Amino acid sequence: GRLIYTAGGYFRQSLSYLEAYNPSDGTWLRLADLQVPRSGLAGCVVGGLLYAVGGRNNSPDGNTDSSALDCYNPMTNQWSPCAPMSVPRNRIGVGVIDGHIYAVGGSHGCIHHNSVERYEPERDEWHLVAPMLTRRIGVGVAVLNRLLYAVGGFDGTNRLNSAECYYPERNEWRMITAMNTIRSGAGVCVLHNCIYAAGGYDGQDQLNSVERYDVATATWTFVAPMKHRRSALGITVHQGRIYVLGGYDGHTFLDSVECYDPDTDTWSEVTRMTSGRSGVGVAVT
Ligand SMILES: CC(=O)N1CCC[C@H]1C(=O)N[C@@H]1COC(=O)c2ccccc2C[S@](=O)C[C@H](C(=O)N(C)C)NC1=O
Ligand SMILES: [Cl-]
């Protein structure tokens, strides 16, 4: 029984919520709140532990970008602080290779990072790796063939359709085929050896379009669009299906959870979050 965890988010301000959805019985679990509210964070799992990486705490009285790394133990229902990153990273992308967390791009105030750093849970240490070829905030990160892909985002001036690839063994980045659509704040994940980029914002509108990268043909192909246009959505893969959680559609903060079936190329609404929010960190354990 694996659960879909949603951490933080934004609605009126940055949120502390930690909730877990059970796709089998359709139930929601209210877990221990994050010690610090955060939106624009990313979640990941290493060794059955959930990690909440970066983000920003938006409050009516002030905002603070986060360099924090926090660890949640499902067995104890406890958050424990870990070593912080070298810099705050709001609107971050995260990816796991060999139980090591890569924190990719994001912003700190006026600064749009191209820097990337890697966390080692065994040492509780962050180390900078080679920076990306492009500054990317609202970046989608996917791990495919033990390579770390950084997909779309925003560079401080322009929203990107470009994508690049990190080779951990060689410690280097290379540009790959650009997507068909410019996407900042999309849901990026890997399903059946493909990278999916669902939703996002193109500089004008929130998107419902979904495209997938096939490594063999090095091409991006459009698949069935989602029912809702959404940017700042949470995304995950559970039992061979894609789940998109919340986001912003240009008018409202969505509580909608859609599920993608690759066999039928269809999306369906599976549940609703307890409240609408955007900028959540999502992971499965
Ligand atoms: C104008 C604006 O963004 N404001 C004004 C001050 C607070 C901030 C706000 O409200 N941010 C939240 C949280 O967003 C995120 O965590 C996030 C995470 C990843 C990528 C991108 C985003 C942005 S999201 O794609 C754009 C969407 C929006 O345009 N409005 C609601 C008007 N904003 C949001 O949901
Ligand atoms: Cl924000």
Numbering used by the authors: 325 to 609
From the paper:
The Kelch-like ECH-associated protein 1 (Keap1) is the substrate adaptor unit of an E3 ligase that regulates the cellular concentration of Nrf2 by promoting its polyubiquitination and subsequent proteasomal degradation. The nuclear factor erythroid 2-related factor 2 (Nrf2) upregulates the cellular defense system against oxidative stress by mediating the transcription of enzymes acting as antioxidants or being involved in detoxification. The Neh2-binding pocket of Keap1 is large (550–780 Å2 buried surface area) and contains three arginine residues (R380, R415, and R483) which interact with glutamic and aspartic acid residues in the two Nrf2 motifs that are essential for high-affinity binding.
In brief, the phenylene moiety of 2 is wedged between the side chains of A556 and R415 facing toward the KELCH channel, while the C-terminal dimethyl amide is stacked against the side chain of Y572. Just as for 1, a chloride ion bridges Keap1 and the serine NH of 2, while the amide carbonyl group in the macrocyclic ring forms a hydrogen bond with the hydroxyl of S602. While the sulfoxide oxygen atom of 2 is engaged in a hydrogen bond with S555, an additional oxygen or nitrogen atom as in 3 and 4 would be oriented toward a nonpolar region of Keap1. A water molecule bridges S508 and R415 in each of the complexes of compounds 1, 2, and 39 with Keap1.
